[PDB]
Amino acid sequence: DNHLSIVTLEEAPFVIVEDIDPLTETCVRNTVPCRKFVKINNSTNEGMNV
């Protein structure tokens, strides 16, 4: 049991997760990656793991 899933909400000044820079790199240095579901339509529940 190594991959311990962590749930996090972005509502307080303790998580400033933003988008990534499209410069052929993952993101800024010394930062761990995460993921979030994105809703396309109010009816469809399909969400890509960006």
Binding site: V28, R29, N30, T31
Partner: protein, 50 residues
């Protein structure tokens, strides 16, 4: 007394002593400052999470 108080508060602003100045740490509409675009300055500021 009011004239003396106005004279002793007549100082417009105090010159910034560096990056540790509290005025810069909390930018507002009364004191606006920014870089150009992507100067070695913007790259350095990107890695500064603080």
């Amino acid at each position: 007394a009011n004239l003396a108080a106005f004279l002793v508060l007549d100082r417009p602003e105090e010159r910034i002593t560096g990056i540790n100045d509290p005025r810069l740490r909390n930018p507002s509409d009364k004191f606006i400052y920014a870089t150009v675009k992507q100067s070695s300055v913007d790259i350095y500021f990107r890695r500064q999470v603080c």
